[PDB]
Amino acid sequence: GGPLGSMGNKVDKLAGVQELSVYEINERDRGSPVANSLGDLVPFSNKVYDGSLQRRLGITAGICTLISHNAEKKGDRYEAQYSFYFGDYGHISVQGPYITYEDTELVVTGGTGIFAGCHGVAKLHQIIFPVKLFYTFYLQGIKKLPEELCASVVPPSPSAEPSEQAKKCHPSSVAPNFTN
Amino acid sequence: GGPLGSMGNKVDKLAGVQELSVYEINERDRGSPVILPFGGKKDENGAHANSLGDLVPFSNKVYDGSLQRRLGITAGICTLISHNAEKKGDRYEAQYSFYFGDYGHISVQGPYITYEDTELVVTGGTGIFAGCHGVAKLHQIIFPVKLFYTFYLQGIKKLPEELCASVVPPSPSAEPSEQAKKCHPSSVAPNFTN
Amino acid sequence: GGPLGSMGNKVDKLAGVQELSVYEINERDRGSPVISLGDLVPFSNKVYDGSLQRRLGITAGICTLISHNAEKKGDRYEAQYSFYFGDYGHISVQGPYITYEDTELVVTGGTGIFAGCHGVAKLHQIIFPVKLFYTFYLQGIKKLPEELCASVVPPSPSAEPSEQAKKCHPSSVAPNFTN
């Protein structure tokens, strides 16, 4: 261990990529929406749970703008800018496509707190449109994620539900000062 | 060898910059752009007058630098910031993306100014553009229907040759090929965005 | 100095972080609003340097109202905007603005001398909502010019820019300061 170990480790961090998965669920209590012609603006904010569905982490918040309608695909293209809030852990910001009829990949434009300085991509997977979504972030350039955010991930499916305690925001099942 | 070479190549990639030029053309076939006259300042006739807060969603076509291949589209929004009686100098703040079909997309954020070249932030990308950062130079050829961009992208692997063809010098007479306009299979990106 | 020095220097730049502080002030001469869920709020205010001796440019972008907090007597906004520093370039941000508390936004990148940057911006509210203080933590760019690194005036309601800066005197502006 020494000079070249130091430099190597620095480079390792700069290039390293970590996975982080979360569920976004519209529980229809925040008055968050749930057209066909370019122009419609859709502000939104849903709840965010961890990959294991045992912890309420926070919320999403941002806007979608309708771009185009696809007849044969039966859906619409939106361009979106929004953030994922994880309480005191910090937040992650994204920019890119949200399309009603398919999964997409968004740009991770950066983050705060433990996500400070991150960059990469977020894979958006639609389980039930539009109320149940699953995301996997691929984050480059940050330190090791805390174990509470890396619990075994429940495979996305229609049956996948947050725990009762997570839904009730029980103190054992929330992130520190979880965003609401 | 290995160790110092491996480290070097890793750093080279993190630091390396590649240029990419494309043409953005509004062919007036997408209902774009739309005016959302939210500023709502009326003039003397009974018409629209630009004011802070007017929102402009938009989506244009994207062709490669050689103008021989249809790549995809832009999609996003502009917000009116400042304006006056002069054609030149109206300022918008914009957030939008460039879609390159299966290659991925690039997102940008920054200034759009009528009749002025500007530079925007490349906030990142996906696919072959995953993890990139840098800037995009915006040049208006024919305001507001024909634009030209050169991206300076840091942090990603060598761009494929199809996206690095000899660039047609940007001028008002620069036009996509007939093949590209009609989206002929030999003149489009894989699953080009539409 | 040599090969390992060259590489180390490159890494140092890619990982290095620099602080940059500015003041944002709504002088009410740009038509920009002073503050219903979903409402959209476009805005543009003036930007001064940390020493308050130099007019740098403006902010420009939008805020979207997300929620009300009855308890805390405030609202949450999600914002996307840029800071313009004249010929120096600009910095773009994305993140939360909350009327009753400080927040941290993402620095999505920059242009000019800020090209290739990333990091975070700490938003401090001095006077609601017309006077704010920011500290940028910028990673990956070369040394900031001294004119942007003058001694920072501690933020307080009393903090005011110099009359030279207010009047955009050549001695107290960024080159081609944004307006």
Please give a quick description of this structure.
The structure is a homotrimer. Chain A is mainly beta and 180 residues long.
Task: Report on the architecture of this protein.
3 copies of one chain form a homotrimer. With 180 residues, chain A is mostly beta strands. Chain A has a single domain (1-180), classed as AOC barrel-like. Chain A is 9% helix and 44% strand. Chain A contains 2 helices and 9 strands; from the N terminus they run αβββββββββα. The first copy, chain A, has helices spanning 3-15, 164-167; strands at residues 17-25, 41-44, 47-50, 56-70, 75-85, 91-99, 104-111, 119-128, 132-140. Chain A has an 8-stranded antiparallel β-barrel. In chain A, a hairpin with a 5-residue loop joins β5 and β6 (91-99). The longest helix of chain A is centred in the first third of the chain and has 13 residues, at 3-15. Chains in contact: A-B, A-C, B-C. The A-B interface holds A 4, 7-8, 11, 14-15, 37-39, 41, 65-68, 77, 79, 81, 95-97, 105-110, 119-121, 138, 140 and B 3-4, 7, 10-11, 14, 30-32, 34, 36, 55, 57, 59, 75-77, 95-97, 99, 104-105, 107, 109, 123-127, 130-131, 133. The PDB classes it as isomerase. Keywords: B-barrel, Oxylipins, allene-oxide cyclase activity, isomerase. It forms a trimeric assembly.
What is the CATH-assigned architecture of chain A?
Answer: Beta Barrel
* CA-CA gap between termini of chain A: 45 Å
- Strand order within the widest sheet of chain A? 1-3-4-5-6-7-8-9
Q: State the share of residues found in helices of chain A, binned by percent.
A: under 10%
PDB class: isomerase
Keywords: B-barrel, Oxylipins, fatty acid, metabolites, allene-oxide cyclase activity, isomerase
Assembly: trimeric
Entry title: Crystal Structure of the Allene Oxide Cyclase 2 from Physcomitrella patens
